[PDB]
Design a protein around this nucleic acid. Structure first.
Ligand SMILES: [Mg+2]
Ligand SMILES: [Mg+2]
Ligand SMILES: [Mg+2]
Ligand SMILES: [Mg+2]
Ligand SMILES: [Mg+2]
Ligand SMILES: [Mg+2]
Ligand SMILES: [Mg+2]
Ligand SMILES: [Mg+2]
Lengths: 216, 159, 60, 179, 51
RNA sequence: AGGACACUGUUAUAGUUAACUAUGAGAAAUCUUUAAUUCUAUGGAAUUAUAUAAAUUAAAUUUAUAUAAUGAAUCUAUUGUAUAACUAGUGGGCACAUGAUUGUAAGAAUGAUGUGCAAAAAGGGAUGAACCUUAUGAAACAUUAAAUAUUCUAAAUAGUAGAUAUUAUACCAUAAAUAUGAUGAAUACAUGUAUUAUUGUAUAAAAUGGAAGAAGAUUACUACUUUUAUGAGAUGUUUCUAA
């Protein structure tokens, strides 16, 4: 069976990835990182809510799956299947090891104790430092109260201390709301599918007019 | 990483970025005489005449000049003491040690001051390097300089 | 004070020179010390506790 | 300090007016001068606090600076009690915070020390961790706290509960009144 | 053995600086071993005709 | 170390006409880059005149060697420095502070820099090889450090305020996720609802009769300042013994 979570909780100094030096690695359990209506454009969901961390820890790969189903099942029940976009940020890269002391030993090719004690791989975790975002939702102006509750249920699946709060950016772009409104007044904004792109004065002049019909 | 002649050289014997290729003609035109000062820098493009990796970047003196080698004397730190080493290298691994040029100019100029004071009866006023002592005095003007008030300021979160 | 007052009438400041020397006092005993801080205490003649010397102040 | 057991009228902290500039060089002779007021115990402690403030607003290292002149400010006290409001920033375990308090004292040197006594219980931090922005004398109709507004009203009378002995002796006979 | 300690490098620096560190003096030049033999024969002939 | 996704290895999803544009995650055996630190070398000899060669050049033309003369040039410390001859013990080590590798973890195993115990006195941590002050012959008098001042026990129950829980140890002799109270504390909103800071209780279970060192303490507990005093081969003053 799987070991308790207190055996793998604190960070080592060096990472240990899957590469040609470490080949035999088992597979993953989590498969869906983005849930909800992810096809909606920039102007549909203008309010983003984050979950910011407060600890230096290892979060297991199996725990990230159960935390996503908890936040997704609640927002369906209240907001609907087409009123939010949910995503997870991190990806598990680190690999753990087990020494695995057995019963039958004291013979050829089965030694005891600390002789030849390099570990064999078991599973994967993600490495999380201080002040890092783990999950996020974007919604409309109505469901601001619901997503502070749905992100609360996901917090009790992780070890440590975490805090949910309201961000001040406009959706899933890296733009503040104050910076967003001045650019849309001038018209130096471009309409890409998921987020925006900023138009500048760097290229040749003939290509600037070619970019201008994809304004908004 | 066993004990060989060229062990543990991955970033010491790598040629830098955008600078590959055989060296130029300004290396070969230089000359060396007995009693100079020479630093050692390995160019990792020729394989005849490379010294050991320990001597990369240490300065010595030139005592012999051969048809294909130059002789350099150094100092190594063997367990208790400081010993004496000699090595023979090629011309494409050296560099003229600067740092005596400001000194040798001071020798030539002080030798001129001694010559002009022979015709007079005065004492010599030599050139030696300056000293730094306590902070000297200075004079500020308050006609165009106005003081700026500085104080604390309340804290504001980044978001 | 006379050179300070004569520059006061023309709105000049005249910050004066530094002192020429310092006074160094040893207070804490130096039994277990690092090899560099043991070498500098030898050059100041400060092997005994509660003792004082005089030292010219330079950049070094 | 005749009746009390500590000096509450002249606290250890004082008021110093400071000024400094950079040492002159060849590229830049005659540079800019600055001025401020810091509260400390001597001019050497006030030199260290002021030079750290100049490290943050401008990129001026304190090793290149030179101290111009520092003098102390004293106030001719009359003895009337006044109202004061102090705004400051304190450092705690989690981060920095900023607050506001209102006090009642004789002078602004004395009104600062009433803040250190209150901060010893509510905040529990060393005295070097509070950074004082400004002290101002408050007139009427700016008092935002009922504690100052309760004592400002005239003709106050209230008695005192007596609990202190009037003899510094080991034993007295029974029925002697310690009034 | 008892699988004892293999070996350390502690106080190698302390044992060195007990009597200081002596610097072996390089002598006069053109006397170290390895001078060019063709250069040395002409140096010998130039000194005999001198004195 | 920090930095970056431009080369090598890796990863989630949306767009435009396989190619370009975005928002996200990364590296013991990746690098367009790149500090603090660690280390090497110079801070006195050079120029002029004359001569020698069997080297060297198209060549008095260079490379070298002599003899004569012309000199004290960065701050601090050190009255000695340098050289030989002869000979013993030891080659099972451990601990603290900083930073690492294997291991679920260990008073576990193995490396790196500094200082100790071993082989080191007195005073303090109730008691302890390694923690904190601290250099050494026999004594007397005054001043402090480390640590303490209800009583055992030398030395002021000398001040502002809070804590209701049989509260109170630098190394040091354990407590968590989580759930809720209280301030004449602060900010936003409508006397109250939201956050932030400080703080109390629950969570909290063992083998003979028990350990804040103990009696006992709610002004002998906790938080923050200024004075006074006690207290070490330490440090001062005087007498005496050792090449
Ligand atoms: Mg070959
Ligand atoms: Mg022994
Ligand atoms: Mg002892
Ligand atoms: Mg104890
Ligand atoms: Mg007593
Ligand atoms: Mg005393
Ligand atoms: Mg003594
Ligand atoms: Mg004594």
């Amino acid at each position: 069976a799987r070991r308790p979570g207190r055996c793998y909780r604190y960070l080592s100094k060096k990472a240990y990835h899957k590469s040609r030096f470490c080949k035999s690695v088992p597979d993953l359990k989590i498969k869906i990182w983005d849930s909800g209506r992810r096809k909606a454009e920039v102007l549909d969901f203008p309010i983003c809510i984050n979950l910011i961390s407060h600890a230096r820890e290892n979060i297991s790969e199996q725990a990230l799956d159960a935390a996503r189903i908890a936040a997704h099942h609640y927002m369906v029940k209240t907001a609907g299947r087409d009123n939010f976009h949910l995503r997870v940020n991190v990806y598990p890269f680190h690999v753990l090891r087990i020494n695995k002391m057995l019963s039958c030993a004291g013979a050829d090719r089965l030694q005891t104790g600390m002789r030849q004690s390099f570990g064999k791989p078991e599973g994967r975790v993600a490495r999380i430092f201080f002040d890092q975002i783990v999950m996020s939702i974007r919604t409309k102006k109505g469901n601001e109260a619901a997503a502070m509750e749905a992100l609360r249920r996901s917090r009790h699946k992780f070890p440590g201390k975490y805090e949910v709060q309201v961000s001040s950016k406009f959706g899933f772009t890296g733009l503040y709301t104050e910076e967003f409104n001045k650019l849309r007044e001038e018209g130096c904004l471009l309409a890409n599918g998921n987020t925006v792109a900023v138009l500048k004065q760097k290229g040749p002049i003939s290509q600037y007019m070619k970019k201008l019909e994809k304004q908004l | 990483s066993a004990g060989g002649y060229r062990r543990k050289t991955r970033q010491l014997l790598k040629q830098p970025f955008r600078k590959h290729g055989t060296p130029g003609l300004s290396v070969y035109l230089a000359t060396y005489r007995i009693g100079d000062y020479v630093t050692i820098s390995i160019n990792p493009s020729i394989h005849k005449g490379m010294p050991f990796k320990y001597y990369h970047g240490r300065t010595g003196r030139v005592f012999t000049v051969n048809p294909k080698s130059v002789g350099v004397v150094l100092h190594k730190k063997v367990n208790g003491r400081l010993s004496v080493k000699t090595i023979f290298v090629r011309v494409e691994h050296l560099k003229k040690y600067k740092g005596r040029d400001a000194f040798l100019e001071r020798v030539n100029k002080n030798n001129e001051i001694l010559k002009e004071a022979r015709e007079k009866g005065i004492k010599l006023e030599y050139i030696r390097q300056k000293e730094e002592g306590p902070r000297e005095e200075f004079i500020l003007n308050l006609d165009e300089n106005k003081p700026v008030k500085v104080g604390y300021e309340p804290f504001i979160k980044v978001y | 004070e006379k050179t300070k007052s004569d520059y006061k009438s023309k709105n000049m400041l005249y910050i004066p020179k530094e002192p020429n020397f310092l006074v160094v006092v040893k207070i804490k005993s130096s039994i277990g010390a690092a090899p560099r801080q043991r070498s500098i205490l030898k050059l100041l003649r400060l092997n005994k506790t509660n003792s004082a010397v005089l030292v010219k102040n330079n950049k070094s | 300090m005749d009746f009390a057991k500590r000096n509450y009228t002249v606290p250890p902290f004082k008021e110093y007016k400071l000024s400094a500039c950079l040492t002159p060089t060849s590229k830049n002779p005659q540079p800019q001068i600055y001025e401020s007021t810091i509260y400390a115990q001597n001019h050497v402690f006030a030199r260290s606090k002021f030079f750290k403030l100049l490290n943050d607003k401008y990129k001026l290292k304190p090793s290149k600076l030179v101290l111009l002149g520092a003098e102390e400010i004293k106030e001719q006290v009359t003895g009337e009690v006044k109202n004061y409001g102090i705004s400051f920033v304190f450092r705690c375990k989690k981060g920095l915070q900023n607050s506001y308090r209102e006090f009642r004292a004789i002078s602004r040197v004395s009104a600062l020390d009433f803040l250190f006594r209150e901060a010893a219980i509510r905040i529990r931090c060393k005295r070097n961790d509070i950074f004082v922005i400004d002290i101002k004398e408050l007139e009427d109709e700016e008092i935002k706290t009922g504690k100052v507004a309760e004592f400002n009203q005239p003709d106050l009378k209230f008695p005192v509960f007596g609990k202190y002995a009037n003899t510094r002796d080991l034993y007295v006979p029974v029925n002697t009144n310690l009034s | 053995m008892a699988k004892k300690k293999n070996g350390t490098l502690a106080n190698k620096n302390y044992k060195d600086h007990r009597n200081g560190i002596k610097r072996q003096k390089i002598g006069k030049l053109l006397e170290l071993p390895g001078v060019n033999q063709k250069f040395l024969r002409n140096m010998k002939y130039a000194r005999e005709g001198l004195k």
